[PDB]
Design a protein around this ligand. Structure first.
Ligand SMILES: Nc1nc2c(ncn2[C@@H]2O[C@H](COP(=O)(O)OP(=O)(O)O)[C@@H](O)[C@H]2O)c(=O)[nH]1
Ligand SMILES: [Mg+2]
Ligand code: NA
Length: 157
């Protein structure tokens, strides 16, 4: 079966771990030690295809990543501001401009929003990447974010 190595990056507190655990374990974590960096697997079906996802939740495996989720939180302007740092890291570690990537705006369940959809869509367009709005709490968008990334890897191959 086809394996996809995915890496989740972004500022502390955006929901990288919550997004990962919701995908893998089907539950929402209200707190998750921010120093734990681990890799997590789930065999899933994406568009009818069975595949293995190896997901590195960051906090010697970044460089082997085939696609990256760049996460910010929609009530965390600072995390949005930091996205360019993580995009550039990824370019450098892959030595490429064309790396499969998805911009994820998480915590969409929260009303105290400060990054609007247009802002984020504009950033995504400046990188040529999809933008997906998620909630790790509700599950909105979660599969779509990871599965879109897999679809970007599929195209890239
Ligand atoms: N309301 C809400 N809280 C979230 C969401 N995702 C994460 N959180 C919370 O935000 C905090 C940080 O999440 P965490 O996954 O540890 O962020 P990380 O540092 O990026 O791994 C925790 O208290 C999570 O419960 C979400 O979509 N909605
Ligand atoms: Mg974490
Ligand atoms: Na503003």
């Amino acid at each position: 079966m086809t394996e996809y190595k995915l890496v989740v990056v972004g500022a502390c507190g955006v929901g990288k771990s919550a997004l990962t655990i919701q995908l893998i374990q089907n539950h929402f974590v209200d707190e998750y030690d921010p120093t734990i960096e681990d890799s997590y697997r789930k065999q899933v079906v994406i568009d009818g295809e069975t595949c293995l996802l190896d997901i590195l939740d960051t906090a010697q495996y970044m460089r082997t990543g085939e696609g990256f989720l760049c996460v910010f939180a929609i009530n965390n302007t600072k995390s949005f501001e930091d996205i360019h740092h993580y995009r550039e890291q990824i370019k450098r570690v892959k030595d490429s401009e064309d790396v499969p990537m998805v911009l994820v705006g998480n915590k969409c369940d929260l009303p105290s929003r400060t990054v609007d959809t247009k802002q984020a869509q504009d950033l995504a367009r400046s990188y040529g990447i999809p933008f997906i709005e998620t909630s790790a709490k509700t599950r909105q968008g979660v599969d779509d974010a990871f599965y879109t990334l897999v679809r970007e890897i599929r195209k890239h191959k």
